[PDB]
Amino acid sequence: TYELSTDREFDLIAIGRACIDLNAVEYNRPMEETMTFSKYVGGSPANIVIGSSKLGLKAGFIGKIADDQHGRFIESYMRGVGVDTSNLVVDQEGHKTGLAFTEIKSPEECSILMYRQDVADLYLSPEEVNEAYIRRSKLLLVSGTALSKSPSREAVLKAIRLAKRNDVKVVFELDYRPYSWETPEETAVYYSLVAEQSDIVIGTREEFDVLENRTEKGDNDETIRYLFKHSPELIVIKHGVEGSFAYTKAGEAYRGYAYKTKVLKTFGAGDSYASAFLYALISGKGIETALKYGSASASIVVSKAMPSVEEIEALIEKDETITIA
Amino acid sequence: TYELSTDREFDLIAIGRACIDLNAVEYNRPMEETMTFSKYVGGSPANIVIGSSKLGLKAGFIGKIADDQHGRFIESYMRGVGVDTSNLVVDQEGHKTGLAFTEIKSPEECSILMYRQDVADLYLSPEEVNEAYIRRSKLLLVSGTALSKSPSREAVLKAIRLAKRNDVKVVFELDYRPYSWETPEETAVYYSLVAEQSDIVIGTREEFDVLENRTEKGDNDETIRYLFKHSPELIVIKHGVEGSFAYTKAGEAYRGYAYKTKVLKTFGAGDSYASAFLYALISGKGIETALKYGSASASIVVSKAMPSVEEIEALIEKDETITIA
Amino acid sequence: TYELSTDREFDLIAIGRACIDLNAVEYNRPMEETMTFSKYVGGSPANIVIGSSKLGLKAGFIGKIADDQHGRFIESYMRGVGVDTSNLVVDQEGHKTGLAFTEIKSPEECSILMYRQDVADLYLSPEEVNEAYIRRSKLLLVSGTALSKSPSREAVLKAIRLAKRNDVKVVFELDYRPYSWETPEETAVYYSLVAEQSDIVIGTREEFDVLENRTEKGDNDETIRYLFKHSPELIVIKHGVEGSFAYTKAGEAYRGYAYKTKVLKTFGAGDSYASAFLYALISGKGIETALKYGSASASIVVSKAMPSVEEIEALIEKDETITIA
Amino acid sequence: TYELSTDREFDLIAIGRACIDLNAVEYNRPMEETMTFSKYVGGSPANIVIGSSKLGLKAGFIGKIADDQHGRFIESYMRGVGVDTSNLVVDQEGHKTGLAFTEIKSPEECSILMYRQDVADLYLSPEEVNEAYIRRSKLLLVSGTALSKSPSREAVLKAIRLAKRNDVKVVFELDYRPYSWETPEETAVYYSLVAEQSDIVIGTREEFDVLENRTEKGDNDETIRYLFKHSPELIVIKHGVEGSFAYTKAGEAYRGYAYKTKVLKTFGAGDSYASAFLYALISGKGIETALKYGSASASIVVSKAMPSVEEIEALIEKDETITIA
């Protein structure tokens, strides 16, 4: 589709969390032994828009930030890397920015100590969601964790409605954070509802299991038979080293491959995947190639500071992928 | 439709609030001057199932009640009037039953002092919603106020999904209680979502305005043009003394009329309307006649202790309706 | 003491809860079977000031009431029985009045279903406690339940300080309501602190056990040896049918007796006891006689609508007391 | 006093907060521009016991820590510097450790972005306060911020009672953190109550103003005339560069002096003051000398990593103090 129904200024606008990541400087050790932390912007939709801007996409953001040095850093950083920050709203009720402290015990053992209670990003409200902003974009990227609590949950539902009625493609990134939710069945309720309304849904197989209210691994053919009764036209299901699979409502299926990588830290793999996959799609590369872009970007981010197009393309050309799994 | 896809034991199962109403014995005065109150079961879906049982329908209920004398009264009363109470769940966290104290200053000035914070009915959770129960019913009656807070909101969303996949007709009663919600836009978000999933939607024009996120009276033709893009096959829009209008997806429209009445107290008019309207529909009377049943029952309940079929039919035969408005 | 250090307009000012009692009309049955309830003002300090006014004392009140028909009833009723309501403050944050529904299964089995969460009376704050009001009184009556939550707890602590520095006698009524507190040790912390600051302490033996952080019945001689290291000059310890004992810092002890009574409902016994005991003390009758006044009033209130001086005195003259226990 | 009524194993046990401080590595800039933070144990009573151990005192601690890497770091660090951690209790309800991010705009402009809501240290409860532990100490150090919320507030009140009845000296460090409290009058209520029960009270003049419920600077002679009606035998009032003053119930007064210092960061000045002042007192140096120890330690901590006895003594000998203010 080489021209759209309306003129678009943004490639994507994401909605939900922009927070602080505090990354362990001394790593491959228990966090108790980590004495210094480096400050970064984090949060799945924030990471996706920052990664997208690094690839040259024009990105915007709908989210709530704290009225303090952490919120001002997040705004200044995003603006400095070329993300539009016009629709970042400053919380006026004393709410703090969420914090993720990262522990890297080894390449295979990484985890986050999260400060998530009553954080500013969860107080984004429907009245702060602007139709005039959303309609200037090709895509609306919705992250699942933004559905974990009201009023953010209703702000997201409002955003999706406004996107759909302005011919803005709704991309749902499943982004599962179990400790942000009360129960997995609660997660299933909102994930199913939102996926059914969305145009593109991207998640791991485990995340689709949650969506479907399952406690055991589901079958991709059943997943898509279900969701293709509803709005989605494209469903991307990721299986880590077993690769990734994209399915279209027209009945085609495409396969992507994990890249061989010297892993340092696995955080951010999924946000790098989404940004590069969407970049490829928006850039006319087609689904099969888009899967390589997402996979290559994921590999670079965990071994590196988000990937450049040049780094992604060099890794794709080198073509050292995993096919044995 | 004179036999269904599966055998049904219940005419309707309602989900949401069963609480205590404390009705002013000395009335036509400020509640400050009311010295005695009579105890009744209240709550919109409770009233609808109690009214339905009085008409001879077989009714069930999904709701949470307090572990105390008020909860036990509600269970015993509903059971005693022939409602199935097998899926009433007793709250084990110390939550109290909601309370409505009624003030009747005059026939034209009635209001409720409500105790609604952290009440037991709002803690109904998805894990307490049983598919095996729902599938034994012709209809699932969902009241709007049950969407006002989690976990009840997710329990209702789960119930609707289970109803739909078991060929149980979803009836959404808009039941608007503004003080149960944070903002009208929040109400619009959930009302729109739920109405779009429902088979039958019943509400006042003001309630549809809320659903549509409007602050001014909407146009019924626009309302139905919207909802008939989605699941509903029947939409009933009530306008008080100006009557009521039912619209079908096939493109038919039917009109009902308010009955002339010596009003005592307006509480319960809407629940009497829904129970008698649904009774008529279930009983094969057709939509135009069903509107008369709902209107006649509404009139009797505010002038009377829920109506009998005989009282409703006598009032319909007498045919003293309002057409001047 | 027949004239005081400053002129006094009030005999007592009480601080804490004024709420609604809903008394079962059909009684000697489970509340499930009680269909009608009569509305009264309740709450221990409210009852004490209403009872005091009925005896002819001049009483005032420091408390917070709801901005609704229940709060306005409480103000109008107290004012109508001669209590000063100038320092009742209206809650502006939507908090409801506490509610006590009374169950009378039999004379020997009475209990309350309480609505106590986030009630208006608990939001009385230090800024709403007026030194100019307190200093116009002979006595400040503090009820223990007002210490159960902030900000009421700090309002009470402020009131006590202001009383003491204006030569206003602090009377601490132990008024134990376990479900208003998180743990008994928490109750002990605040009860001990407040009793140590008070001039007169009145409670049941069980209430003093709570004060002392004991789970077994304590010894009155040990209780008073403890508290007489601190502020109290008079300690009254009640033992139901075994009578009541008052102890002075000077080392005297006095005994009172329960009155034989045809019990209907035991609620309010303690508030009737405190009001009549204080009336007798204020009226120069001395401690031994004051114990008879408290006991007689307790008997009348549970068999009856608060006692008159004439009813109390007639019962004392009749002298049908319990001495066998 | 060269031998005590009972044998003592600890010089001091402190009660309240042990948390994480995240200190700006790149400083003399807005925190937005600070990219790296170093992890330390913080919290006023924690700092006081860590500083005390560095001076060679035997210290213990009563506090609650998170069940995570931050709580385990705090325990391991305190233990590693010789503080007894036997009465650190691990929170089992998912509460996080408080966090202080430090901003150093310049030597004269330092501030903290605090994460303080529902933090683990505030859930220390009376049942977790052990009399057998407290009685093994010479002193109990109570920090004011531990009174800011229940259940910590009641745990502290319990600790003070147990200290007093075991001849353990109660030292109240006023430690004022306004954003931990609802209102200054609330702070005054608890600070006044606790100071009245304490043996030694240490605070800035501004902190005593808060204690006294004043919004303007108070007069030390009035402050001590008040508190010397109650338990204190020693009151230390600090005035920054104008020095510090200690007053005894016997009627003596002593003056201390601020040390000239190249200030880097003012955090921790007060905790260094308290630890070194108490060290001097415990070590028989007398009050006038103890004031020099507190002042010298304060100077070193803000210009430096807590002071050694040797560093403190060298600074005292050098005797470069401020007397012009």
From Swiss-Prot, chains A, B, C, D:
GO MF term set: 5-dehydro-2-deoxygluconokinase activity; ATP binding
InterPro entries recorded: Carboh/pur_kinase_PfkB_CS, DKG_kinase_firmi, Myo_inos_IolC, Myo_inos_IolC-like_sf, PfkB_Carbo_kinase, PfkB_dom, Ribokinase-like
Catalytic activity entry: 5-dehydro-2-deoxy-D-gluconate + ATP = 6-phospho-5-dehydro-2-deoxy-D-gluconate + ADP + H(+)
GO process annotations (BP): inositol catabolic process
Gene3D superfamilies: 3.40.1190.20, putative 5-dehydro-2- deoxygluconokinase
Tagged with keyword Membrane: no
This protein's pathway: Polyol metabolism; myo-inositol degradation into acetyl-CoA; acetyl-CoA from myo-inositol: step 5/7
EC numbers for this chain: 2.7.1.92
Keyword entries, A-Z: ATP-binding, Kinase, Nucleotide-binding, Transferase
Pfam families xref list: PfkB
EC main group: transferase
Family affiliation: Belongs to the carbohydrate kinase PfkB family.
Function: Catalyzes the phosphorylation of 5-dehydro-2-deoxy-D-gluconate (2-deoxy-5-keto-D-gluconate or DKG) to 6-phospho-5-dehydro-2-deoxy-D-gluconate (DKGP).
Protein's name in the database: 5-dehydro-2-deoxygluconokinase
Taxonomic source organism: Halalkalibacterium halodurans (strain ATCC BAA-125 / DSM 18197 / FERM 7344 / JCM 9153 / C-125) (Bacillus halodurans)
